[PDB]
Design a protein around this ligand. Structure first.
Ligand SMILES: O=C(O)CNC(=O)C(=O)O
Ligand SMILES: [Mg+2]
Ligand code: NI
Ligand SMILES: [Zn+2]
Length: 331
C-alpha cells in the first residue's frame, strides 16, 4: 500500500506531465497521495497562470465577510458578518493597514503560533467565493476554468445527463482569514491555486480517519451537533493542531506559497488560514474514484449549509433516498 502513513506528498511534474490533468491526478493517486487528503503540486518552471497581476485591482468583492470568532483559542466557531462592497485595490489596502497586517514574525512556525494564540481576538475580512478566474485563456495546462466538469464526469461514469455547471471561485485573503474544518460538497475533490501574495497554511485529516475528526467535533461543539448530524457542512468550526494532538486525531500540515497548487481528495477534511494579503482560485472536480464517495457523503438537511444549484442533481442521482429531506433543507 503506497503512502501508508498518509503523509502529504509534493509533486514536481515536468512540462510534458503537466499536459494531461486527469492522467496526473491518477498518477498521484498511484503513489498514494490521496491517503493524506491533500497534495501539493509545484508547476514546471516553464509554466505560468497569466502574464502579470498588475491589472486586478478593479475586481469587485461584492460581499466581503468579517469573520467573527466565539469560543476559546483552540476551539472556536466563526460567523460571517457581511460588509459593504469593495474593490480588490481597496481590500489590499485594508489588508496592509496597521489594524489588519501580518505582524512581525521569524518564520512560518512563529506565525502559526501567533495565529493559534491570537486569532479569536481579531475579526479579519475575507473576500470569498467570488465567481471568476484569473487564468489567462491562453494557459492550456492546469487552467482551473477549463477543467472537465463534474456533470460530464457523472455522465461518463453513470450514463445520466444532468443539469448544472461547475465554475471557479476567487478568494482574496488577509492575515488571519480562516477556512473552517470541512470536506467538499458531496465529498468532491478540490484544486486551489495561490495566484499571488502571502502564503496559506493548511491542515488536513486523512480520509480514512475522517470519522475521528467528526467524533471529536461532536464532543467539542455539542449544541451544534444536536442541531445537525452533519454540522461540519456549515463550515464554521475550528480546532487547533494542539487540540487535535491532545485528542489523538491524525493530521498533517503544510504551507502553500504563491505559484503552487493544492489538491484536496474526497473526504479529506481540511482547515487553514492566510498569512497576509493573497488571492487564490479554486474549483471542485471529480474523477471516477470520487463516485463512491459521492454516494456515501453526509448531508446537512437542517437548513444551514445552503449550496449551489448544481448539488441538486448530485444528491438526486447518487443519493435518491436522501434527496427529499435534503431538498427540504434547501427550501
Ligand atoms: O482557500 C480557502 O479559503 C479555502 N479553500 C478550500 O477549502 C479549497 O480549496 O478546498
Ligand atoms: Mg481589475
Ligand atoms: Ni475546501
Ligand atoms: Zn446542518
Amino acid at each position: 500500500a503506497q503512502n501508508p502513513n498518509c503523509n502529504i506528498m509534493i509533486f514536481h511534474p515536468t512540462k510534458e506531465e503537466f499536459n494531461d490533468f486527469d492522467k496526473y491526478i491518477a498518477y498521484m493517486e498511484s503513489q498514494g497521495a490521496h491517503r493524506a487528503g491533500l497534495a501539493k503540486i509545484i508547476p514546471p518552471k516553464e509554466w505560468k497562470a497569466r502574464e502579470t497581476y498588475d491589472n486586478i485591482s478593479e475586481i469587485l468583492i461584492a460581499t466581503p465577510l468579517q469573520q467573527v470568532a466565539s469560543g476559546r483559542a483552540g476551539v472556536f466557531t466563526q460567523y460571517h458578518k457581511k460588509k459593504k462592497a469593495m474593490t480588490v485595490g481597496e481590500y489590499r489596502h485594508l489588508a496592509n493597514s496597521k489594524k489588519y497586517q501580518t505582524p512581525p514574525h521569524q518564520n512560518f512556525e512563529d506565525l502559526e503560533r501567533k495565529y493559534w494564540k491570537n486569532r479569536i481576538y481579531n475579526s479579519p475580512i475575507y473576500g470569498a467565493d467570488i465567481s471568476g478566474s484569473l487564468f489567462d485563456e491562453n494557459t492550456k495546462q492546469w487552467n482551473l476554468g477549463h477543467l472537465g466538469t463534474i456533470q460530464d464526469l457523472l455522465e461518463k461514469e453513470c450514463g445520466v445527463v444532468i443539469e448544472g455547471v461547475n465554475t471557479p471561485y476567487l478568494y482574496f485573503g488577509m492575515w488571519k482569514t480562516t477556512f473552517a474544518w470541512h470536506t467538499e460538497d458531496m465529498d468532491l475533490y478540490s484544486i486551489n491555486y495561490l495566484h499571488l501574495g502571502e502564503p496559506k497554511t493548511w491542515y488536513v485529516v486523512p480520509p480514512e480517519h475522517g470519522q475521528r475528526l467528526e467524533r471529536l467535533a461532536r464532543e467539542l461543539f455539542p449544541g451544534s451537533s444536536r442541531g445537525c448530524g452533519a454540522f461540519l457542512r456549515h463550515k464554521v468550526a475550528l480546532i487547533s493542531p494542539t487540540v487535535l494532538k491532545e485528542n489523538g486525531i491524525p493530521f498533517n500540515r503544510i504551507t502553500q506559497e504563491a505559484g503552487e497548487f493544492m489538491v484536496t481528495f474526497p473526504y479529506g477534511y481540511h482547515a487553514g488560514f492566510n498569512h497576509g494579503f493573497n488571492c487564490a482560485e479554486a474549483i471542485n472536480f471529480a474523477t471516477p474514484r470520487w463516485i463512491d464517495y459521492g454516494k456515501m457523503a453526509s448531508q446537512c438537511s437542517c437548513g444551514e449549509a445552503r449550496v449551489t444549484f448544481s448539488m441538486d442533481a448530485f444528491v438526486r442521482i447518487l443519493q435518491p433516498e436522501r434527496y427529499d429531506l435534503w431538498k427540504r433543507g434547501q427550501d
